[PDB]
Amino acid sequence: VVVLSFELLHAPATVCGPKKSTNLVKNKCVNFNFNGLTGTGVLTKSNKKFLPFQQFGRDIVDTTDAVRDPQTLEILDITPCSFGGVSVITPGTNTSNQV
């Protein structure tokens, strides 16, 4: 017999179960999670020159636009997926119904 006590107390845990991952899809709108970096967008290949301790990348207004993938250490751009407004053009309903 063995006693495997799973003590969890005030001292930091630092003893947790593993975490699996999935594939990488490029040039497709998708959700993502990189060690706890939520967000959605299109992941492509970038030509930036991260120093070998920098993970994120940020613009003049603090919007994340670059990520270093954990397993394979390359650089991916991040562009949010398409959005915009919609306007409807009509003649009067007293006249017609096409738009």
Partner: protein
């Protein structure tokens, strides 16, 4: 002309990219040892980090 609503392209799937898994805690040796001495003199080791 009337500005009614908005317009968006929906996400396709989901991706998770946690890093490589290593530094597996040792547990086979406790189970696979073929001996635990005795119940009044048992072997214990603390496993952490």
């Amino acid at each position: 002309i009337y500005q009614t609503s908005n317009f968006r392209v929906q996400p396709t799937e989901s991706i998770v990219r946690f890093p490589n898994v290593t530094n597996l805690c040792p547990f086979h040796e406790v189970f696979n040892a073929t001996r635990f001495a005795s119940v009044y003199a048992w072997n214990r080791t603390r496993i952490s980090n």
